[PDB]
Design an enzyme around this catalytic site. Structure first.
Site, PDB file in Angstrom:
ATOM      1  N   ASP A 120      -2.789  29.622  38.459  1.00 61.57           N
ATOM      2  CA  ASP A 120      -2.932  28.963  37.172  1.00 61.57           C
ATOM      3  C   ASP A 120      -4.437  28.894  36.909  1.00 61.57           C
ATOM      4  O   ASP A 120      -5.207  28.567  37.810  1.00 61.57           O
ATOM      5  CB  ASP A 120      -2.349  27.549  37.254  1.00 61.57           C
ATOM      6  CG  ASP A 120      -2.382  26.821  35.924  1.00 61.57           C
ATOM      7  OD1 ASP A 120      -1.672  27.259  34.999  1.00 61.57           O
ATOM      8  OD2 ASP A 120      -3.114  25.814  35.808  1.00 61.57           O
ATOM      9  N   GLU A 165      -4.177  33.901  35.561  1.00 61.87           N
ATOM     10  CA  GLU A 165      -4.819  33.856  34.248  1.00 61.87           C
ATOM     11  C   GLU A 165      -6.311  34.106  34.413  1.00 61.87           C
ATOM     12  O   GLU A 165      -7.025  33.275  34.973  1.00 61.87           O
ATOM     13  CB  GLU A 165      -4.632  32.479  33.607  1.00 61.87           C
ATOM     14  CG  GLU A 165      -3.243  32.176  33.076  1.00 61.87           C
ATOM     15  CD  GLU A 165      -3.134  30.750  32.562  1.00 61.87           C
ATOM     16  OE1 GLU A 165      -3.144  29.819  33.397  1.00 61.87           O
ATOM     17  OE2 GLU A 165      -3.054  30.557  31.327  1.00 61.87           O
TER      18      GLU A 165
END
Ligand SMILES: OC[C@H]1O[C@H](O[C@H]2[C@H](O)[C@@H](O)[C@@H](O)O[C@@H]2CO)[C@H](O)[C@@H](O)[C@@H]1O
Ligand SMILES: OC[C@H]1O[C@H](O[C@H]2[C@H](O)[C@@H](O)[C@@H](O)O[C@@H]2CO)[C@H](O)[C@@H](O)[C@@H]1O
Ligand code: CA
Ligand code: CA
Ligand code: CA
Ligand code: CA
Ligand code: CA
Length: 1052
Positions: free
Chosen positions: A646, A675
């Site tokens: 994340d 990400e």
């Protein structure tokens, strides 16, 4: 050695003292030396009142809009007020104002017993009440902010000390440094002398490399100073204080203790000889290990032993402590509160916990009692060794409650639990089993580590399937709301929500109104709120007390790999913690080693919140170690096959790569991706972004094809949501009534889509919309280079995810009014085809195969079972079940009301149709190695496109994959080449590109008949191929006795 003292030299005197039945109040206003004219204190006034508490005031002011309570007089040090009194005993309440605002945000009590002279003074922006203007004055020269950085043993970086004659670092073991009664700083200290930042510090903290540097004597006892509060103070030659601020010590902590501490193991380590507890707390004054019984009674409190070299504390005991509950009793200075705090904290290296994470527990994960039968022999169903292996990855992003909360065919006690995955007879499990058989290879799980936003004590939770009466008993907000009347009804919350639907609209969003309250005490949350990084979540277990959750988590993992045949990826959130500070229930790391595990603002020392919450500091050595140690447990003890980081962009590129190196030693085939957007942390270190990770083997979600196919961007609101059509929703070819997209803009999106289907490689060569030869890096994506990867395995393509609106909801926002229900189902399939038939790794949201809707909700993290519903009984797709949360989608209510009822809501007929289309696509993806080449150079040698340039037929994507003699070896013995044709348009299109080449429609699509995405496609004798509107066709060149000519990549 001048004695630093508060500016007492030119201190203000007393304008006037109180007499009989009167109280004087001063407002010390630091007037600049240039004070040439008495400032205007005319708009200055106070608010008097004598309620029950204090009643000494004589005829106090009434209205708040009364500014006639102006100053009685003023001088070079501010105005003053003479408040009349009825009694010279008691107190009074006042509020210093400058008009209508509050010069001071707090109520003041002038206790006469504290100030016999009844003559106090106040400071603008101060909460305390002083006895004289002299005191209040010196008070404005105290400690403020924390822009001093002690980065290494002998280096201090601090702006406020530049040019100042006297620069020193004062310190106090148990107290808060500050000028004594006199007004001088008598605390112990060390003298600092100006210096230049060395090369080492400059490299470690580039963002501070331009700060004024100061040197500390080499014989300074760093260990002692770090035991309490440290403050940097600056003063002139006369020794008067100019400024004093707190010090950020993360840097010196790493330079002093990190290497020694990195060499040790942490947590409650249960071995042969017994158990060894170890926790890193380099600044703590004392640490004790508190042992608790099962009923949470203190059994013993053991002072721990501190290792001087590492700053770690340890305690060794017998193996009889297995299963015991414990916490660390800390005695440590916390800079945020400027106090030596005393509190009990759980173990950041905890591997087991009690209900709701109140106590950590001693556990040995190797224990057979915590493993399901045959666990040690659990194999990985899908290979991840070579790039070709990795390229086959096809991910289904799921959530524990989204999967089974609504499935009546799942035993009631297992709904919303890890164990739901073991109910082979349920609709949900049978559905996943079929997806796996059809080509879905990996299940990615939203947060299953210990999250903090769901209460694990069942009696404190109420879910929509239960009585409204239960909701009222656990939720006081509901009991005092407009829905209180339902408290004594006999309906369940879900039944109430269902009846509220008919009258729900943009003008009466009553469904979300009630649901917003339900969300506070239900069992639902995505879980991006880390409490403990290496313990499974407790609410997903049938029993959250103790070790039970460990075996249940493993049973689920085994079920997925062994019975469903899919690999498992875990979503991890090391970029932030749920909370920081010395008081919050969920603050763990920042309580044990204050100001070290969190990233702080360079000037204020406040914990940053760019991630959403309490930003962590992966750039600090011991947190990097915690992360790597944590990943090691999930890998080895839980057999996770891959990890999705994340907000990976908030981590240094070097840290992610180092962690990967460490884990590859445990599992050489582990896969890392995440990400890689822009975190704005580039000033501090090289970030783990899409651009920087090129060629590293670390994957990143690509937003290029995502936006080109979905249309628009994640920040669109209002009419923009409808105006920004995507390739999947008819950009250019089937415009809605609001859009202004030109043909040129539509073709640019097609360029981005083609590039993505080829792996979004930086060096891939294609013909753009204008007919120009371009490399992937030359195709623009909002000002940035489109193609960024070296290998397609470094790119994760997708058109739907847990974040933002679902694919179906986007198509609903963008589709032209004339596109009927059937057409929209094909749009969803066409959009997914660009991902499934592409070279990049394929990723998708749970339920895209069922046209999943969240009733237009954009960020559903806390929108509960209602808006996140996935119906495996196939009755509907959860569309049109009420307006979404007004707090985040209220600005979209107008556009929603306009597009919502364009066509009917999908039913069983449409859902079955979509699942078939979906499985057709995943089956095609794995039907040939040509779809997943894995290596960048190989993609460039075999992949090409047709229907390109200025004369192209808009919306038609045609990709060729060569397996002929010019490509090299024949990777597929059944074909000499493959053609992928996606007709994202309302017209039939005819291809003449392969005339006289003996092309054949894939056997898989032929077998689907009129249920195929290629239904109606016709391969004529003249070799031409005609595709119907909104269709997808995979054609192949059958291979003869020897390797044929195939489909050679055209020279450009
Ligand atoms: O509860 C924290 C935060 O969680 C979600 O944001 C996540 C997002 O889901 C992830 O995909 C990634 O972007 O990291 C974010 C922060 O962890 C919610 O969207 C957000 O509202 C919520 O505050
Ligand atoms: O949780 C952070 C944020 O991440 C995503 O936004 C990305 C976007 O997808 C990229 O294309 C690019 O614009 O960077 C953004 C972050 O700065 C999610 O789309 C968004 O919902 C989420 O809040
Ligand atoms: Ca006084
Ligand atoms: Ca939890
Ligand atoms: Ca919730
Ligand atoms: Ca910053
Ligand atoms: Ca071949």
């Amino acid at each position: 050695d001048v004695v630093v003292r508060l500016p007492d030299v030119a201190v203000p005197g007393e304008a006037v003292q109180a007499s009989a039945r009167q109280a004087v109040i001063h407002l010390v206003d630091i007037a600049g030396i240039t004070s040439s004219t008495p400032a205007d204190y005319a708009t200055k006034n106070l608010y008097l009142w004598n309620n029950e508490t204090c009643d000494a005031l004589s005829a106090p002011v009434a209205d708040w809009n009364d500014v006639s309570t102006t100053p009685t007089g003023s001088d070079k040090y501010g105005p003053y007020w003479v408040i009349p009194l009825t009694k010279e005993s008691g107190c009074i309440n006042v509020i210093v104002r400058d008009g209508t605002n509050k010069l001071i945000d707090s109520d003041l009590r002038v206790s006469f017993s504290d100030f016999t002279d009844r003559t106090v003074s106040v400071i603008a922006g101060n909460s305390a009440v002083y006895d004289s203007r002299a005191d209040a004055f010196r008070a404005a020269f105290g400690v403020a902010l924390a822009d001093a950085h002690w980065v290494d043993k002998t280096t201090l970086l601090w702006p406020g000390g530049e040019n100042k004659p006297i620069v020193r670092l004062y310190y106090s073991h148990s107290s808060k440094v500050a000028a004594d009664s006199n007004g001088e700083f008598s605390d112990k200290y060390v003298k600092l002398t100006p210096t230049t930042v060395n090369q080492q510090v400059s490299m470690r903290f580039p963002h501070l490399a331009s700060y004024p540097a100061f040197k500390l004597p080499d014989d300074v006892n760093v260990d002692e100073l770090l035991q309490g509060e440290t403050v940097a103070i600056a003063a002139e030659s006369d020794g008067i204080l100019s400024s004093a601020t707190q010090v950020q010590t993360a840097g010196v902590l790493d330079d002093t203790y990190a290497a020694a501490a990195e060499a040790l193991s942490y947590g409650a380590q249960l071995t042969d000889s017994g158990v060894t507890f170890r926790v890193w707390a380099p600044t703590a004054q004392q640490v004790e290990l508190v042992i608790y019984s099962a009923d949470k009674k203190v059994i013993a409190s053991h002072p721990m032993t501190r290792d001087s070299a590492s700053g770690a504390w340890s305690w060794q005991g017998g193996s009889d402590l297995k299963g015991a509950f414990y916490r660390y009793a800390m005695t440590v200075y916390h800079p945020q509160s400027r106090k030596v705090e005393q509190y009990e904290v759980t173990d950041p290296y905890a591997h087991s916990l009690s209900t709701n994470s109140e106590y950590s527990q001693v556990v040995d994960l190797n224990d057979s009692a915590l493993k399901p039968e045959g666990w040690d022999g659990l194999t990985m169903p899908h290979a991840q060794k070579t790039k070709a292996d990795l390229a086959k990855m096809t991910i289904h992003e799921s959530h524990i409650r989204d999967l089974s909360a609504w499935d009546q065919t799942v035993p009631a006690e297992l709904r919303g639990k890890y164990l739901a995955l073991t109910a082979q007879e349920s609709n949900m499990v049978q559905h996943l089993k079929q997806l796996s058989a059809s080509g879905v290879t990996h299940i990615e799980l939203l947060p299953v580590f210990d999250l903090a936003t769901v209460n694990e004590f069942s009696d404190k939770v109420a879910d929509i399937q239960q009585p409204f009466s239960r909701l009222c008993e656990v939720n006081s907000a509901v009991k005092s709301s407009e829905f209180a009347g339902y408290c004594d009804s006999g309906s369940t919350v879900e039944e109430v929500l269902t009846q509220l639907k008919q009258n729900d609209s943009k003008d009466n969003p009553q469904v979300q109104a009630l649901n917003t309250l339900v969300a506070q005490t239900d069992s639902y949350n995505w879980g991006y709120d880390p409490f403990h990084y290496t313990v499974p979540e407790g609410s997903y277990a049938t029993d959250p007390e103790g070790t039970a959750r460990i075996k249940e988590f493993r049973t689920m993992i085994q079920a997925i790999k062994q019975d469903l045949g899919m690999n498992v990826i875990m979503d991890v959130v090391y970029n932030h913690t749920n909370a920081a500070g010395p008081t919050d229930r969920t603050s763990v790391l920042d309580k044990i080693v204050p100001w070290y595990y969190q990233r702080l603002n360079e000037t204020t020392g406040s914990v940053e919140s760019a991630t959403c919450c309490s930003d962590s500091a992966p750039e600090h050595r011991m947190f990097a170690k915690l992360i790597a140690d944590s990943l090691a447990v999930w890998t080895t003890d839980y057999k996770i096959d891959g990890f999705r980081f994340d907000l990976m962009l908030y981590h240094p590129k070097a840290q992610i790569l180092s962690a990967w190196e460490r884990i590859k030693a445990l599992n050489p085939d582990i896969y890392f991706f995440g990400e890689g957007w822009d975190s704005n942390q580039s000033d501090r270190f090289e970030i783990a972004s899409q651009i920087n990770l090129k060629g590293t083997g670390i994957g990143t979600f690509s937003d290029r094809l995502r936006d080109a196919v979905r249309g628009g961007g994640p920040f669109d609101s209002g009419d923009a949501l409808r105006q920004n059509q995507g390739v999947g929703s008819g950009a250019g070819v089937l415009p809605n009534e609001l859009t202004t997209l030109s043909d040129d803009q539509a073709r640019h999106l097609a360029d981005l889509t083609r590039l993505g289907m080829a792996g979004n490689l930086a060096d891939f060569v294609l013909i753009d919309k204008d007919g120009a030869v371009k490399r992937g890096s030359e195709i623009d994506y909002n000002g940035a280079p489109g193609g960024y990867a070296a290998d397609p395995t470094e790119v994760v393509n997708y058109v739907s995810k847990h974040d933002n609106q679902t694919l179906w909801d986007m198509i609903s926002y963008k589709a032209a009014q004339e596109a009927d229900l059937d057409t929209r189902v094909r749009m969803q399939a066409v959009s997914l085809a660009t991902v499934m038939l592409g070279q990049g790794i394929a990723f998708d949201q749970q339920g895209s195969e069922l046209l999943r809707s969240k009733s237009f909700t954009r960020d559903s993290y806390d929108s509960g079972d209602w808006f996140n519903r996935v119906d495996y009984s196939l009755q509907d797709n959860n569309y049109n079940v009420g307006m979404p949360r007004s707090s985040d989608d209220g600005s979209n209510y107008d556009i929603i009301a306009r597009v919502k009822d364009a066509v009917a809501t999908p039913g069983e007929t449409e859902l079955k149709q979509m699942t078939a289309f979906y499985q057709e696509l995943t089956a095609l993806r794995k039907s040939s190695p040509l779809f997943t080449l894995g290596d960048g150079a190989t993609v460039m040698k075999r992949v090409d496109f047709r229907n390109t340039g200025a004369d192209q037929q808009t919306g038609l994507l045609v990709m060729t994959i060569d397996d002929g003699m010019q490509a090299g070896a024949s990777l597929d013995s059944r074909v000499d080449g493959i053609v992928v044709a996606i007709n994202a348009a309302p017209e039939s299109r005819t291809l003449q590109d392969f005339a006289g080449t003996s092309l054949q429609l894939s056997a898989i699509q032929q077998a689907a008949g009129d249920r195929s995405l290629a239904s109606g496609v016709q391969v004529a004798a003249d070799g031409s191929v005609t595709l119907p509107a909104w269709s997808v066709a995979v054609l192949e060149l059958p291979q003869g006795e020897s390797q044929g000519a195939g489909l050679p990549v055209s020279s450009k």
